[PDB]
A paper describes a structure:
Although integral membrane proteins like GPCRs are challenging to crystallize, a highly successful strategy is to engineer a fusion protein replacing the third intracellular loop (ICL3), located between transmembrane helices 5 (TM5) and 6 (TM6), so that the inserted fusion protein can mediate crystal contacts. By exploring various fusion strategies, we determine a 3.4 Å resolution structure of antagonist-bound inactive A2AR in detergent micelle and a 3.7 Å structure of unliganded inactive SMO in a lipidic environment.
Unlike the AlphaFold prediction, the PGS is oriented beneath TM bundle without a continuous helix between TM6 of mSMO and the C terminus of PGS, but a contorted loop that allows the PGS domain to directly interact with the mSMO 7TM bundle. This unpredicted hydrophobic interaction with the intracellular side of mSMO likely stabilized the orientation of PGS relative to mSMO. In comparison with previous structures of SMO, our structure of apo SMO resembles the inactive SMO, with an overall RMSD of 0.75 Å in the 7TM region and a conformation of TM5 and TM6 that is consistent with an inactive receptor.
Residue numbers in the entry: 195 to 441, 1001 to 1207, 450 to 499, 510 to 556
The structure:
Amino acid sequence: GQCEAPLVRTDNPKSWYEDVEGCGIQCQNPLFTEAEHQDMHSYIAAFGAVTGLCTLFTLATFVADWRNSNRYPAVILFYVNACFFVGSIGWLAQFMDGARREIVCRADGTMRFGEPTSSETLSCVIIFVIVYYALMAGVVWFVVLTYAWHTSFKALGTTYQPLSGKTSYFHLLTWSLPFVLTVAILAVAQVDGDSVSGICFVGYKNYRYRAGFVLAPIGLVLIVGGYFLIRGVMTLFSIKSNHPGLLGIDCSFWNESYLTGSRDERKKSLLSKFGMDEGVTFMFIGRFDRGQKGVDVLLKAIEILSSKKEFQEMRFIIIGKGDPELEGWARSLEEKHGNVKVITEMLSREFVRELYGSVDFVIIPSYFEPFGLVALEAMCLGAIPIASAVGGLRDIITNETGILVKAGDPGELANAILKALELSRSDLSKFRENCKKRAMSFSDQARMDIRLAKNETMLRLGIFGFLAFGFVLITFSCHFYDFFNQAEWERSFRDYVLCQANVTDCEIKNRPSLLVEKINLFAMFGTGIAMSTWVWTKATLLIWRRTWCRL
Ligand SMILES: CC(C)CCC[C@@H](C)[C@H]1CC[C@H]2[C@@H]3CC=C4C[C@@H](O)CC[C@]4(C)[C@H]3CC[C@]12C
């Protein structure tokens, strides 16, 4: 009945150490002393309390006005805060009286490992699933947050709400995936306790399961989250370089005051410069590519259009360079039909701005268009677009704004040009007015989609996307570091424990670093705290101020 510390005597055949019959390992990490146990427990308490309180307040803010705040692209972070709140409560459970022994220790006083098991209680499993599910549920929402930001740039020039029909689709995948992982861990009975952290978690006894079920899934969400974030940056940077100020009023390289004179006066000036007489002007600018922009379609349409008697009533201009055969084809038509201008050089932005604001119609014969930002500048300048019904550009152009055609059909395109002539013989003022109003608006007029309203889902969302990414990257690094060195610490732990009995000095080769543990906790709690600032604005204070006035 004798066992030497750190081992204790028990009658459980499942608690005995490798060959030491009757003796198992006490429920106290032998590689750390009491003083640093109290330090770590105090450290956890501070972050847990702060995360719980601040996260709960944000959740209270959303439900205070759920009828108006329940808007899909702006409530992704609400579920993120919900996930982290549950995780925080899971961590804080250990600070109830006697909780650590009931959670970490077996009834015989030995360390819990290999849970679940029918011979012990459910306290270790309950804490494990709460914390682990909360962790994985949160980071799965994070990749949804970045994806929403990536697609939120489609909410310009249209009324269509992206992902409006996919809200339940995300939810089912978001909650199902962490549930599957949780069940997989329980199926292999790898839930182990640790007095240092104060909770049960994966793979303390075997590093391989901790790498598989924690490190690996966290790595994948970082890859996906980074991918969408990178594309979002390219979109946002591309906007500011080319069309900055595509925002609440209008202020860019375009402005109403930059161009002078009437529409006809500028048209006559440009046509004089090109040696052309008055007519209905159709303009296209773009790269002379194949399969991406229909330059071949546009050029072929002119050949078909050349047979009509109305051909002499219209004026054309093509700007761009690229494949030399398209360039030769365009120049040949220029000489064959002396009513079209061909430009292959680099054209200044100043010239383009005046050209866009003078030409009657702009042609966009694309084969693919991401979401149609290139068509918005022409609409801002009063041009009436004719475009292929491809990509996300179909959501911008409507019957009262322009003409859509099937891609690849030069005959249909020519018919659309003939339709443009029918409109051009009448008053086009309504079409130009609709083009400007639509391009600088969206249908989310809950509070006047202006710079104080729509920047929420373009700029503010972007900040939190990268902010969450940073903390999750730190968490990945901590687990990555431990995984590299866990194998040696296991060997050290084995060697250290054996010499303790002294059955006639022991030394610790190495151990897990408490500093890495603190940083990992900081990043985990930091994400919950960081995402709790979404509602830190003046408007929410007013809501709370009036909410308190229910009294
Ligand atoms: C490597 C990537 C994923 C990191 C995250 C992307 C970073 C670089 C992006 C995402 C969000 C972006 C910011 C979003 C907010 C604004 C406000 C805007 O008025 C000016 C640009 C500015 C300041 C952006 C600068 C670049 C930014 C911080």
